[PDB]
Amino acid sequence: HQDPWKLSADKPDSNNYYGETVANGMIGIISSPEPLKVKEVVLAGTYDIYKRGRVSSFIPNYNLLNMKLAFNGESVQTYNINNYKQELDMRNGAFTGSFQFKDLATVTYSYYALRHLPHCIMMVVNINTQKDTEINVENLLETPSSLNNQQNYFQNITNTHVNIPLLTSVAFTPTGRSKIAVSNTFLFDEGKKLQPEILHRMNDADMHAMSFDKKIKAGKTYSFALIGSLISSDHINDPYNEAERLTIYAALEGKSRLLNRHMQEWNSLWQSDIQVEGDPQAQQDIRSMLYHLYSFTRKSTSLSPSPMGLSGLGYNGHVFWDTEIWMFPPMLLLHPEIAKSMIEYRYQRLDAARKKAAIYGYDGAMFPWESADSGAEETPVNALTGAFEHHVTGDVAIAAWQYYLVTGDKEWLKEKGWPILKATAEFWASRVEKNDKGEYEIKNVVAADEWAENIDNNAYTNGTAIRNLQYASKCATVLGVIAPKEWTLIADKILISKMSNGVTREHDSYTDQNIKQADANLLAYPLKLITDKEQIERDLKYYQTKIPQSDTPAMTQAIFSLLYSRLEDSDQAYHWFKDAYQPNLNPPFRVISECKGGTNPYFSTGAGGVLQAVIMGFGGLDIDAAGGIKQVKSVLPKNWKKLTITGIGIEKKTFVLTH
Amino acid sequence: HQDPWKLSADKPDSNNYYGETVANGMIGIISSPEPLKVKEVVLAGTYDIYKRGRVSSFIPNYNLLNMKLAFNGESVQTYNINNYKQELDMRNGAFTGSFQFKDLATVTYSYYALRHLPHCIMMVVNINTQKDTEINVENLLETPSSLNNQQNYFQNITNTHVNIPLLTSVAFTPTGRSKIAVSNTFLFDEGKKLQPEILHRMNDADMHAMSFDKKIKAGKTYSFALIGSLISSDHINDPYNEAERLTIYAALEGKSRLLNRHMQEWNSLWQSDIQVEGDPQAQQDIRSMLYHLYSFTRKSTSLSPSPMGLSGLGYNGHVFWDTEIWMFPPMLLLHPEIAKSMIEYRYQRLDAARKKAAIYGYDGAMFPWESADSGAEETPVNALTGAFEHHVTGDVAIAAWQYYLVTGDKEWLKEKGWPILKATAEFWASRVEKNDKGEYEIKNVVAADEWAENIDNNAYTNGTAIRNLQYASKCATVLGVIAPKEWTLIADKILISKMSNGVTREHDSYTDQNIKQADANLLAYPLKLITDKEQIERDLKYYQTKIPQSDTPAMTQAIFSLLYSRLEDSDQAYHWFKDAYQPNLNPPFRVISECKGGTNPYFSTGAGGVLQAVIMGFGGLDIDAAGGIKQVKSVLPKNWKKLTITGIGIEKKTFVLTH
Amino acid sequence: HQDPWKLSADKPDSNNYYGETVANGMIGIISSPEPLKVKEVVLAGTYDIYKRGRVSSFIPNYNLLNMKLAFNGESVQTYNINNYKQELDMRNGAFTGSFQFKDLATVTYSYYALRHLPHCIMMVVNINTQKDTEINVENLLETPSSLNNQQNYFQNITNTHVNIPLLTSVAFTPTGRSKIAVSNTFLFDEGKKLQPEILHRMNDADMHAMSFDKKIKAGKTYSFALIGSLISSDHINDPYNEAERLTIYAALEGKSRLLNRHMQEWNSLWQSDIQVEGDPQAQQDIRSMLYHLYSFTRKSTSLSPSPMGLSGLGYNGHVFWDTEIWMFPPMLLLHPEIAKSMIEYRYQRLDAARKKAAIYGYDGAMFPWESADSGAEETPVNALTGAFEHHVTGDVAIAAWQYYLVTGDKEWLKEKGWPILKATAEFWASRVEKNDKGEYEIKNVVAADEWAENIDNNAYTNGTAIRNLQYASKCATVLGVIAPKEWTLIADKILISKMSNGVTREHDSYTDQNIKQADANLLAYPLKLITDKEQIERDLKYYQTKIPQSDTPAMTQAIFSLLYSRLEDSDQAYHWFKDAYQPNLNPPFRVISECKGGTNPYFSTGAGGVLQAVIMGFGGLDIDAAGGIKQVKSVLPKNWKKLTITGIGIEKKTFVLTH
Ligand SMILES: OC[C@H]1NC[C@H](O)[C@@H](O)[C@@H]1O
Ligand SMILES: OC[C@H]1NC[C@H](O)[C@@H](O)[C@@H]1O
Ligand SMILES: OC[C@H]1NC[C@H](O)[C@@H](O)[C@@H]1O
């Protein structure tokens, strides 16, 4: 189970199973241990009041692939199959199951969130017989209890050449805020005259189904596909007609064309890859990380990943600095156009940030701690982060400047970067307070160490304000505009203090408290405010043991790894690399939970972190302050013979590292 | 009945009557055979789910002019009047009825969709008595069954000088998507003290009425008017108050001011005119075509005509390439500012085109086959054109470039033309596939010949892609912007094939099939990809026979006419000119149906086609690729002594043609 | 009661009491005569159909400060309190009440609409007992009858450090157009362990309450605060969560930080001030005028004041030319950034003005007589002003040009001023009619003298059209853009006529009618079309006695004052100054009603007028047509020893005047 491209599980154990996800940046499908079922489906961009937090949330959607298969009128179940296996092919996001039913037939089924068609899904089923048998196949559209006011439809779309049977449902999110349409069809190879008649049943309030029978002789392979389109009022004005239209189009494209297009898109994604020689487990793990990031983003959009991407409802689907600081930097280097989507998400919500600033008594743009559809604040009111954790504004500005540094796109800087950088700088200029010594303080925040609440002069926050102001001033110079000279004066005098031992103080109330996650250490990377090697080391020595083993998110150890790599300490770098995700894994596919021993995968934030430890740490790759990508000194784990990183920067460079 | 300015009908035959329309680009009113009634009223820009196609539709609206007239308490009906006549004055869009009631009085009534006031209507009624008589007059607001949740209101708006009685109705389209308000008033000449008291009855769930009596002595003329305002939530935030406000405004402007303004606007429209000497029927017919286009469009808006304009619900009020290719070119030459509205419709829906492209796996902007309020696809799901007829994107780009060529407005090119041209070119670049010989193919479309479904390399479609790409590249050069060099490379290598007989092949599966309408012939005009005269001729010879007499729309013969005019073949040109619309006519006003012997007027697309045959064909007028309007060789029908075309181009030129 | 900074009232008389307002540009709170109650609360930007006019309106909001106080379970009443006093401190918008309960304790309470936090309020309560006693305190959230579908909530927001109890209500405006959320908390000094337990009762459908008891020992002061946040769907997508979030944030900021920020903002506002020596009553009155303007506007927004600011539902909260011509000029001179908000209100509604123009048959932008949320017309239909009072378009243009003149901001001219000026000029170009002598007329308007309805060539209206056209042409020149030369030709020939006595004729039907308010006199100031002193004087002589004593708004005499000051006639200037507001005052705080002896304060329009009489009249300050602020000859009232005006223009100049 250490193929570098495939994750595999034998005989799923439902008592200890955490599904894997396939996704195209719009729809995500999470596996079930049960054959021919899926656990959960999630549509990006669709939010309503639901469960956790009393704020907007992703909504569990139609489990549109659910099928029941019977042989000779005997239902297939986990309990009467054998040789049952599941595999995820990360090369093309194909989830496949396979099993034997008694003495009758082998079943293989593969499903896909099609890469080119954001709202279309497909499952292909093959049955290979060892004896004569008749299958009954049923596709179920059960309206989840998250949705309401459902309607269940069925019709035949025909011409002289086809009969396309459409199983359609339409329903609402809990407050009526979004309308959801799903439309499914079966695709056969045998043509209109010979295809099975499709029956429709509507026996339940919350479920309807289409079904058919097929006699198959011994020694034959019978194939069929299920295509499904899932779309909402958040994506299109008339989701009902659009879903039908999409499934009909996909049906007439046909399995072969769909999968060819799908594969082309995935092949382009994997032109940026990380290859490790001498450690199969590392190789597979890093592939899983890349795969989940690629699955949970989409080029040419305004979508941004939640901390859990499309793996579920984790953190209500909300967007945090988890994007800008954690998932964005690796995507910027490998695929700038994915990064472009992430920052586009922020650019389009600049106006709601302006609104937030005004409501909280400030100038410019104040980005929310948690963001969703509108760009307004979405943090649950019970968390003081919503009101008080303000570094997110600086995080957005850092991302925006980085995007420009890497691409050199001055047109985008003028159209999008500068709006962001200017407004966010204006925020910080209004956020600081000058004291009697002419220093600038940022008081009463929640720190990046979120256990420290309502404290003053948080190191990380104050670091982001410095960068935000500096970068906005540089941006002005690039565009030939005059920037308020206050921005520089403030930046140069924002307080970052040291304790008597010379260690960066986390905040004004800080002595030796345990901390939730990296904060002061973030001034070294990614901010690069602290570049002195002895200072990096002292901060590392002092804080690295301040993060407890339990209930601490995967937003720490990856940075420790990167910083030890930069210091050229292989044993330390490798210790922290492994510690950042290996204690967080869930079976059977080594998905990453938020915390050690956690059970809430997939935490895509953690993946993005570790990916920087690999690319920026072991690879030595770094965003040069004067533009483009550079390489600094680095070390590999002892047991790594070669590290190869492809498709870096706009020149798409390959970096090879050996001992 | 061959006045060059008036269409007239004696004694309307209700068993065989197709009403004429008066319209101001916003409201259309379709005549009834019955006196003092109207058949149908349609409001542009208002769409909701309704009947045909399960998709958005124009909605039958309040027949706000319906009046009942009684003499000595005896209702006027078709059955008790005599000398009944109707006439449409195309000079000012006045529909007039006139009749005699027994021995008592002559009635004349004229109604108008006021040209300056998009939401206001007026009917003027004159009664000339031959004996003493008392009239009872009633104005009815019946809520059509297309609307729901109606409220019926009545009030008196007063000051010391006036009493303006308002009959008001407010209701909803089927799904609640639009709120509709209608407000009517009666205008008298005799002033507040002497005017009839107005009674209000609300006897039915779906109808209320205002009424009055008036004694008139023998030998006197008594005049009154009905003013009506009709508006929706699609046009204004508060339609209820806005309708009342408008009717009060119009009332205090008075009949005389309203008609003077109305006539000024119509006079401006007719400064661009076509005059034919030697054929009264041609003259009247071409006037009707101009009149319908002028009535169904409006300068300084973002409105675009449906194929049936405001003549009714035809094609659900949706916008098709019927605008860009068929109705737009004649309007661009005669009145550029009307063309500007047509393309503005598309510019404002550029975003919904981008959305469609992404949903179907493409870059840039993919315009919908059928468009309505949002700009999203509105083609009924049962018709495969929705998903597969793709030339519409190129049609929109061609229109946009043409607009620039004719006006020379480089500011508009930068602000509106280039956005369109760039996105649409990006679509085609993503739509083509390169083959092993370095040619580019466009596979799996429905052709302009819509009877050819799911075929490859449609001549017309491939023609539009070439033009779209070339024009986008030229546009880039004009604005000094760098365009992807791919656009030219692709354009130059898109496939256009010939069969062994040297005739342009319609598509890759094409041999000798009957075709719905012109396709390959369109490469000659309007695309002008084929300029070789022998090639034009061969394509004409081959395909002209391929269109059946039945169920083929009026989007063919007009092109045949134009192309024979260009070749200087008068007899052929004239045969096809007449064949394009004369077999499609409906009595008593010679309105045009979509197909030969059809019964679904008024097909404004057909009119636009024929108008190009006249202007571009017989007139020889042509949009020069380097800018402005030029004239190429042409011929007139034998029986036409003179053809005069006025107000052409931004220089407003007159073209005179004789044998 | 003539402190120059405080308005004060002893023993409020509920039978003759008009409350004063505290406001921050977003929320207004109007005082009650009763202790620890407020009369009315109004939220800017929230409109729905409600009562007057059948059109959108501000809505009575939660009286969120209402408290009941008891000693030893004996409620505070008028009948058992003594030295009851109220005071408004204009320095910081603090409304304070103070009183004695029997012989046992002194209570003071001060409330604030916090200047930095647009949606937050605070009341601070101090109780000093002279014997041991127990207070019961109750904060009531009664849902006003203006709102519907209310929900009453209560919860505890905690961490180890705090327990923040939230009393929250959510409700809807009459039609469901706006959702309103209010969330209150109590702030204690004594910390989490020792703070009173908070009880919650929900005994009524429309009222719930939080309460607590506290023992206070003899000779001790017990202090607590109430913080309230009031917000709607018009301000934020999720008002319910945002209100809770804001109150939590304010609570953790704490009273002291909030009042510090509050005071900083007020201190900046008062850096522009008017000081009079030798007339305490004048000084206090002019301070009240300034105070009300500062309270009813807000820098860095798109908010514009209604004629009654945030003092209540006066004129349904609608925006009129009352802003551009009456409130805007004094704010432009003193604080340009407040003026910038006023014109931003119009810039953001330019599109709805374009819509209105098209609906009424005109080009460009036609601003509504009455404006609210959308920018569409909101005048009640029963007032002919809505359809016919057209000078508002010119008024908006004049304001826009003035803004540029004073600031010199050419970036804003290009981005915002020119759009407005161009569209509005295009309106007038389409609005005029040329007659036989080559003059231009504007026919069928309601005049600025609104008693003149449906008349032609109103002096004021025609004056605004001249200015609008001239300013748009000048604006074009500044930006190097070509303007239609028709604008100048029209401007130069618009009709302004004189009667035989050489007096400016108000309109074409005008001889000697009484008039509602200044019209022809407005051509002298503000338009400055009439600069000849003898002409000014003759117009003044003829019209000044044409305004009746009764039911004439305060939009006349202040102009008379300014014009007599410009003529150097102190006795006349001073007569008209006092006449403009002194007969309009209401007790106990000298609030200004709309008309003499009126009872509908606070008419902020009137205040703006008088403030121009002071600044532009007595101060001689004037907007120079070539840019910046200048000073012309002027006179002071005899009894004024010195007039000092501070913070004028972008150079923030001080003007000092003596005899
Ligand atoms: O994953 C989202 C969120 N969880 C809590 C963490 O402390 C914070 O750093 C992160 O943004
Ligand atoms: O007129 C609407 C529509 N009808 C069908 C025709 O074939 C097509 O060309 C046209 O666009
Ligand atoms: O104060 C609002 C409105 N009331 C009536 C006045 O006549 C008018 O001039 C003013 O704009």
PDB file of N, CA and C in Angstrom, chain C residues 120-169:
ATOM      1  N   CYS C 120     -23.083  51.252  17.586  1.00  0.00           N
ATOM      2  CA  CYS C 120     -23.039  51.027  19.029  1.00  0.00           C
ATOM      3  C   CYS C 120     -23.412  52.265  19.847  1.00  0.00           C
ATOM      4  N   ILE C 121     -24.165  52.000  20.929  1.00  0.00           N
ATOM      5  CA  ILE C 121     -24.632  52.961  21.911  1.00  0.00           C
ATOM      6  C   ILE C 121     -24.081  52.572  23.281  1.00  0.00           C
ATOM      7  N   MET C 122     -23.954  53.538  24.219  1.00  0.00           N
ATOM      8  CA  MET C 122     -23.647  53.235  25.606  1.00  0.00           C
ATOM      9  C   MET C 122     -24.333  54.204  26.564  1.00  0.00           C
ATOM     10  N   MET C 123     -24.908  53.655  27.639  1.00  0.00           N
ATOM     11  CA  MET C 123     -25.373  54.435  28.769  1.00  0.00           C
ATOM     12  C   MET C 123     -24.554  54.059  30.018  1.00  0.00           C
ATOM     13  N   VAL C 124     -23.992  55.056  30.693  1.00  0.00           N
ATOM     14  CA  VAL C 124     -23.233  54.871  31.928  1.00  0.00           C
ATOM     15  C   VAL C 124     -24.061  55.409  33.097  1.00  0.00           C
ATOM     16  N   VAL C 125     -24.252  54.553  34.109  1.00  0.00           N
ATOM     17  CA  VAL C 125     -25.101  54.854  35.239  1.00  0.00           C
ATOM     18  C   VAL C 125     -24.228  54.832  36.490  1.00  0.00           C
ATOM     19  N   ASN C 126     -24.330  55.916  37.285  1.00  0.00           N
ATOM     20  CA  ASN C 126     -23.664  56.040  38.573  1.00  0.00           C
ATOM     21  C   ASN C 126     -24.719  56.326  39.640  1.00  0.00           C
ATOM     22  N   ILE C 127     -24.637  55.562  40.726  1.00  0.00           N
ATOM     23  CA  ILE C 127     -25.560  55.656  41.837  1.00  0.00           C
ATOM     24  C   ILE C 127     -24.744  55.833  43.109  1.00  0.00           C
ATOM     25  N   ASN C 128     -24.997  56.929  43.846  1.00  0.00           N
ATOM     26  CA  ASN C 128     -24.357  57.185  45.125  1.00  0.00           C
ATOM     27  C   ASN C 128     -25.413  57.137  46.220  1.00  0.00           C
ATOM     28  N   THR C 129     -25.335  56.166  47.127  1.00  0.00           N
ATOM     29  CA  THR C 129     -26.328  56.049  48.186  1.00  0.00           C
ATOM     30  C   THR C 129     -25.753  56.662  49.458  1.00  0.00           C
ATOM     31  N   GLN C 130     -26.638  57.208  50.303  1.00  0.00           N
ATOM     32  CA  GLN C 130     -26.230  57.838  51.554  1.00  0.00           C
ATOM     33  C   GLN C 130     -26.636  56.945  52.732  1.00  0.00           C
ATOM     34  N   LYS C 131     -27.226  55.778  52.414  1.00  0.00           N
ATOM     35  CA  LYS C 131     -27.475  54.690  53.352  1.00  0.00           C
ATOM     36  C   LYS C 131     -27.293  53.350  52.640  1.00  0.00           C
ATOM     37  N   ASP C 132     -27.059  52.265  53.396  1.00  0.00           N
ATOM     38  CA  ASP C 132     -27.064  50.926  52.818  1.00  0.00           C
ATOM     39  C   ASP C 132     -28.370  50.722  52.047  1.00  0.00           C
ATOM     40  N   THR C 133     -28.307  50.152  50.840  1.00  0.00           N
ATOM     41  CA  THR C 133     -29.514  49.939  50.056  1.00  0.00           C
ATOM     42  C   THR C 133     -29.241  48.910  48.962  1.00  0.00           C
ATOM     43  N   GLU C 134     -30.321  48.324  48.412  1.00  0.00           N
ATOM     44  CA  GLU C 134     -30.230  47.410  47.296  1.00  0.00           C
ATOM     45  C   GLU C 134     -30.969  48.008  46.098  1.00  0.00           C
ATOM     46  N   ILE C 135     -30.278  48.079  44.959  1.00  0.00           N
ATOM     47  CA  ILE C 135     -30.876  48.480  43.704  1.00  0.00           C
ATOM     48  C   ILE C 135     -31.312  47.227  42.922  1.00  0.00           C
ATOM     49  N   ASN C 136     -32.474  47.301  42.255  1.00  0.00           N
ATOM     50  CA  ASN C 136     -32.835  46.360  41.196  1.00  0.00           C
ATOM     51  C   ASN C 136     -32.789  47.146  39.897  1.00  0.00           C
ATOM     52  N   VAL C 137     -32.088  46.605  38.892  1.00  0.00           N
ATOM     53  CA  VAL C 137     -31.915  47.278  37.619  1.00  0.00           C
ATOM     54  C   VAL C 137     -32.491  46.370  36.546  1.00  0.00           C
ATOM     55  N   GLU C 138     -33.301  46.931  35.642  1.00  0.00           N
ATOM     56  CA  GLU C 138     -33.898  46.160  34.555  1.00  0.00           C
ATOM     57  C   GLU C 138     -33.720  46.884  33.230  1.00  0.00           C
ATOM     58  N   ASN C 139     -33.192  46.186  32.206  1.00  0.00           N
ATOM     59  CA  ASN C 139     -33.035  46.720  30.862  1.00  0.00           C
ATOM     60  C   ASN C 139     -34.064  46.051  29.979  1.00  0.00           C
ATOM     61  N   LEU C 140     -34.936  46.833  29.326  1.00  0.00           N
ATOM     62  CA  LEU C 140     -36.067  46.273  28.590  1.00  0.00           C
ATOM     63  C   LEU C 140     -35.825  46.430  27.091  1.00  0.00           C
ATOM     64  N   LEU C 141     -36.084  45.339  26.335  1.00  0.00           N
ATOM     65  CA  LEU C 141     -36.117  45.417  24.892  1.00  0.00           C
ATOM     66  C   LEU C 141     -37.556  45.134  24.467  1.00  0.00           C
ATOM     67  N   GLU C 142     -38.305  46.219  24.277  1.00  0.00           N
ATOM     68  CA  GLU C 142     -39.658  46.196  23.737  1.00  0.00           C
ATOM     69  C   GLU C 142     -39.599  46.363  22.224  1.00  0.00           C
ATOM     70  N   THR C 143     -40.207  45.392  21.492  1.00  0.00           N
ATOM     71  CA  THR C 143     -40.250  45.465  20.046  1.00  0.00           C
ATOM     72  C   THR C 143     -41.283  46.531  19.697  1.00  0.00           C
ATOM     73  N   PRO C 144     -40.926  47.624  18.992  1.00  0.00           N
ATOM     74  CA  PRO C 144     -41.922  48.635  18.638  1.00  0.00           C
ATOM     75  C   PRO C 144     -42.975  48.042  17.697  1.00  0.00           C
ATOM     76  N   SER C 145     -44.141  48.710  17.651  1.00  0.00           N
ATOM     77  CA  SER C 145     -45.241  48.195  16.843  1.00  0.00           C
ATOM     78  C   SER C 145     -44.980  48.407  15.358  1.00  0.00           C
ATOM     79  N   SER C 146     -43.956  49.194  15.022  1.00  0.00           N
ATOM     80  CA  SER C 146     -43.480  49.301  13.651  1.00  0.00           C
ATOM     81  C   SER C 146     -42.889  48.005  13.083  1.00  0.00           C
ATOM     82  N   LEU C 147     -42.430  47.084  13.949  1.00  0.00           N
ATOM     83  CA  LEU C 147     -41.745  45.875  13.527  1.00  0.00           C
ATOM     84  C   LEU C 147     -42.621  44.659  13.812  1.00  0.00           C
ATOM     85  N   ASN C 148     -42.224  43.519  13.241  1.00  0.00           N
ATOM     86  CA  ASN C 148     -43.041  42.324  13.233  1.00  0.00           C
ATOM     87  C   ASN C 148     -42.134  41.089  13.259  1.00  0.00           C
ATOM     88  N   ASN C 149     -42.723  39.974  13.707  1.00  0.00           N
ATOM     89  CA  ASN C 149     -42.112  38.661  13.664  1.00  0.00           C
ATOM     90  C   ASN C 149     -40.865  38.588  14.539  1.00  0.00           C
ATOM     91  N   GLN C 150     -40.935  39.254  15.705  1.00  0.00           N
ATOM     92  CA  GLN C 150     -39.812  39.432  16.591  1.00  0.00           C
ATOM     93  C   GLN C 150     -39.444  38.109  17.255  1.00  0.00           C
ATOM     94  N   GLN C 151     -38.147  37.989  17.566  1.00  0.00           N
ATOM     95  CA  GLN C 151     -37.645  36.911  18.406  1.00  0.00           C
ATOM     96  C   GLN C 151     -36.798  37.506  19.529  1.00  0.00           C
ATOM     97  N   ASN C 152     -37.045  37.024  20.752  1.00  0.00           N
ATOM     98  CA  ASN C 152     -36.348  37.504  21.943  1.00  0.00           C
ATOM     99  C   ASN C 152     -35.390  36.457  22.514  1.00  0.00           C
ATOM    100  N   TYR C 153     -34.097  36.817  22.538  1.00  0.00           N
ATOM    101  CA  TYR C 153     -33.032  35.899  22.949  1.00  0.00           C
ATOM    102  C   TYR C 153     -32.254  36.413  24.159  1.00  0.00           C
ATOM    103  N   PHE C 154     -31.496  35.497  24.775  1.00  0.00           N
ATOM    104  CA  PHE C 154     -30.652  35.769  25.910  1.00  0.00           C
ATOM    105  C   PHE C 154     -29.612  34.643  25.991  1.00  0.00           C
ATOM    106  N   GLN C 155     -28.327  34.999  26.172  1.00  0.00           N
ATOM    107  CA  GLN C 155     -27.317  33.961  26.384  1.00  0.00           C
ATOM    108  C   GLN C 155     -26.100  34.574  27.095  1.00  0.00           C
ATOM    109  N   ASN C 156     -25.218  33.693  27.561  1.00  0.00           N
ATOM    110  CA  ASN C 156     -23.971  34.044  28.227  1.00  0.00           C
ATOM    111  C   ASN C 156     -22.784  33.684  27.337  1.00  0.00           C
ATOM    112  N   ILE C 157     -21.980  34.685  26.992  1.00  0.00           N
ATOM    113  CA  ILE C 157     -20.726  34.499  26.284  1.00  0.00           C
ATOM    114  C   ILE C 157     -19.617  34.474  27.330  1.00  0.00           C
ATOM    115  N   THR C 158     -18.861  33.367  27.409  1.00  0.00           N
ATOM    116  CA  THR C 158     -17.909  33.220  28.492  1.00  0.00           C
ATOM    117  C   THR C 158     -16.530  32.790  27.988  1.00  0.00           C
ATOM    118  N   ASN C 159     -15.559  33.036  28.867  1.00  0.00           N
ATOM    119  CA  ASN C 159     -14.266  32.384  28.911  1.00  0.00           C
ATOM    120  C   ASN C 159     -13.897  32.451  30.394  1.00  0.00           C
ATOM    121  N   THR C 160     -12.663  32.043  30.753  1.00  0.00           N
ATOM    122  CA  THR C 160     -12.277  31.969  32.156  1.00  0.00           C
ATOM    123  C   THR C 160     -12.275  33.365  32.779  1.00  0.00           C
ATOM    124  N   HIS C 161     -12.181  34.409  31.948  1.00  0.00           N
ATOM    125  CA  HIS C 161     -12.037  35.785  32.379  1.00  0.00           C
ATOM    126  C   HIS C 161     -13.369  36.552  32.422  1.00  0.00           C
ATOM    127  N   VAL C 162     -14.355  36.246  31.547  1.00  0.00           N
ATOM    128  CA  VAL C 162     -15.558  37.077  31.444  1.00  0.00           C
ATOM    129  C   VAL C 162     -16.842  36.252  31.363  1.00  0.00           C
ATOM    130  N   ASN C 163     -17.940  36.886  31.785  1.00  0.00           N
ATOM    131  CA  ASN C 163     -19.305  36.440  31.501  1.00  0.00           C
ATOM    132  C   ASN C 163     -20.066  37.658  30.969  1.00  0.00           C
ATOM    133  N   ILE C 164     -20.304  37.656  29.653  1.00  0.00           N
ATOM    134  CA  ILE C 164     -20.941  38.749  28.945  1.00  0.00           C
ATOM    135  C   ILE C 164     -22.353  38.295  28.626  1.00  0.00           C
ATOM    136  N   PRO C 165     -23.372  38.727  29.392  1.00  0.00           N
ATOM    137  CA  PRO C 165     -24.750  38.322  29.115  1.00  0.00           C
ATOM    138  C   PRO C 165     -25.364  39.214  28.038  1.00  0.00           C
ATOM    139  N   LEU C 166     -25.934  38.574  26.995  1.00  0.00           N
ATOM    140  CA  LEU C 166     -26.446  39.245  25.813  1.00  0.00           C
ATOM    141  C   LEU C 166     -27.965  39.128  25.794  1.00  0.00           C
ATOM    142  N   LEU C 167     -28.632  40.288  25.787  1.00  0.00           N
ATOM    143  CA  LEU C 167     -30.059  40.399  25.566  1.00  0.00           C
ATOM    144  C   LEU C 167     -30.240  40.860  24.129  1.00  0.00           C
ATOM    145  N   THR C 168     -30.792  39.960  23.312  1.00  0.00           N
ATOM    146  CA  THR C 168     -30.831  40.209  21.887  1.00  0.00           C
ATOM    147  C   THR C 168     -32.269  40.135  21.397  1.00  0.00           C
ATOM    148  N   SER C 169     -32.599  41.028  20.473  1.00  0.00           N
ATOM    149  CA  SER C 169     -33.849  40.914  19.727  1.00  0.00           C
ATOM    150  C   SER C 169     -33.579  41.009  18.224  1.00  0.00           C
TER     151      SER C 169
END
